[PDB]
Design a protein around this ligand. Structure first.
Ligand SMILES: Cc1cc2nc3c(=O)[nH]c(=O)nc-3n(C[C@H](O)[C@H](O)[C@H](O)COP(=O)(O)OP(=O)(O)OC[C@H]3O[C@@H](n4cnc5c(N)ncnc54)[C@H](O)[C@@H]3O)c2cc1C
Length: 430
């Protein structure tokens, strides 16, 4: 272990940072760990390079529950992560007949687990209980709304937390490569052409290691052939600027989320509110040849805002973002938006992670399939990547995260197939 060399591709993003953090915590020697990314520090294009992410408990399968609970504990109690968890609660609400049904089911599932989640997860049946948790709302704004309130949840200062890990890693002596020195191009193989011995970057720099971890997020299926198990998709956000007076009225407000509208966060320290809508995501299919594919293939390739800073998002997303504002922040309907952005994740067909050794390449570990909801696992997801690397990962977890082509990841569990950027005008200003 003190002898084992590991390269983490995508080490500037969420799963890569966590993996590098846990390699150190488990006693790997820091000079033996190499972190590679296109972008330095917290990578500009990482899905974790954000003002804020939601912290909440999700319960779809067994792993989801264990991982959620452990991660919540570390956000609350881990010295490294504590400064970046804002435990302001999260309201999940609805007013549509079908949306309240989904919410009642969410509450029952928490109940049915029977391990105490209903203590910190409270049903809000009347507008007056909603207004007590969110005073900024008015009574007429919340007419007909029902809520499930997670007193345990809140939001995570995402980019700041990733930066904190990176500072820790640098202080311990981990090696880094960025730019074309850190841009993965292909694995390197022993004489057998199937045992991985390292990787090459686009400049020809060859890194040799016992294990290679591919934590390249939405770019993972573009870099190596995942047999179309993963479809990368974009979601959207924009920012609004509050006056100091308005910003004060919103301090410590809980995260508010409605699956038919979107969600928003309390102002950051500069008075900026991030607003998101909720929808099935955007694909951007384009001819590309991932390593290991026999031919160029039509696959969803992120259109990176870091690479194309004039990009915004589609006009259809301008409509739905302004609908979220009108529902949650009706007094701000005339505020101008800025920093319109597309942010990329990669869905699997069943919305579980893809964390496994590549079927044919020994010592090449995939660690992706984040499916748009894994940033909350920053403190602990790396623990299980290292467990897999070591051969100690539980069989139920390995099974849930295994190599498993065959499903429809374009629909995934979103209830509609992502629409493509080629059919959605308004985002490109080239
Ligand atoms: C709009 C939006 C809102 C979200 N909100 C939430 C939320 O509230 N809560 C939550 O839990 N999750 C949320 N998510 C999902 C969450 O952000 C992701 O699941 C998670 O951050 C993905 O982590 P990752 O490590 O797989 O990818 P990333 O963090 O994107 O890391 C991938 C890394 O790989 C690097 N890379 C790419 N290509 C190469 C290459 N060729 N060589 C080397 N490195 C490379 C990239 O630069 C990047 O640093 C949201 C996602 C979106 C889009």
């Amino acid at each position: 272990r003190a002898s084992t060399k590991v390269v983490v591709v995508g080490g500037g993003g969420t799963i890569g940072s966590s993996t590098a953090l846990h390699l150190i915590r488990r006693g790997y020697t820091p000079s033996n760990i190499t972190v590679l990314d296109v972008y330095k520090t917290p990578s500009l294009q990482s899905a974790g390079h954000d003002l804020n992410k939601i912290m909440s408990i999700r319960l779809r399968n067994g792993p989801d529950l264990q991982l959620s609970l452990e991660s919540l504990d570390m956000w609350q109690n881990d010295e490294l992560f504590k400064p970046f968890f804002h435990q302001v609660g999260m309201l999940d609400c609805s007013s549509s007949k079908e949306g309240i049904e989904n919410l009642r089911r969410k509450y029952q599932t928490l109940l049915d687990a029977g391990i105490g989640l209903e203590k910190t997860n409270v049903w809000l049946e009347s507008e007056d209980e909603i207004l007590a948790k969110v005073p900024n709302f008015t009574r007429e704004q919340v007419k007909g709304w029902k809520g499930l309130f997670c007193t345990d949840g809140g939001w995570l200062a995402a980019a700041k937390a990733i930066n904190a890990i990176g500072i820790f890693l640098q202080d311990k002596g981990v090696k880094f490569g960025f730019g074309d020195a850190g841009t993965f191009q292909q694995p390197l193989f022993a004489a057998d052409g199937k045992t991985c011995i390292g990787l090459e970057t686009t400049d020809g720099t060859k890194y040799f290691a016992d294990k290679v971890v591919l934590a390249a997020g939405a770019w993972s299926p573009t870099l190596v052939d995942l047999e179309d198990q993963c479809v990368s998709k974009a979601w959207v956000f924009a920012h609004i600027q509050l006056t100091p007076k308005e910003a004060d009225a919103y301090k410590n407000v809980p995260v508010v989320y409605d699956g038919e509208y979107g969600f928003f966060f309390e102002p950051n320290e500069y008075g900026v509110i991030k607003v998101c809508d909720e929808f099935p995501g955007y694909s951007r299919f384009k001819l590309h040849q991932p390593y290991g594919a026999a031919s160029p293939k039509m696959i969803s390739v992120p259109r990176s805002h870091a690479k194309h800073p004039t990009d915004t998002y589609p006009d259809a997303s301008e409509v739905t973002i302004r609908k979220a504002i009108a529902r949650f922040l009706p007094e701000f309907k005339d505020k101008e938006l800025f920093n319109r952005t597309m942010c990329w994740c990669t869905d699997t067909a069943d919305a579980n992670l893809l964390i496994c050794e590549h079927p044919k390449w020994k010592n090449f570990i995939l660690a992706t399939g984040d499916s748009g909801h894994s940033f909350k696992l920053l403190p602990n997801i790396g623990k299980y990547v290292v467990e897999l690397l070591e051969g100690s990962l539980s069989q139920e977890m390995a099974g849930a995260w295994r190599w498993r082509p065959g499903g429809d990841a374009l629909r995934s569990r979103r209830g509609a197939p992502a629409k493509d950027l080629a059919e959605m005008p308004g985002w490109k200003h080239d």
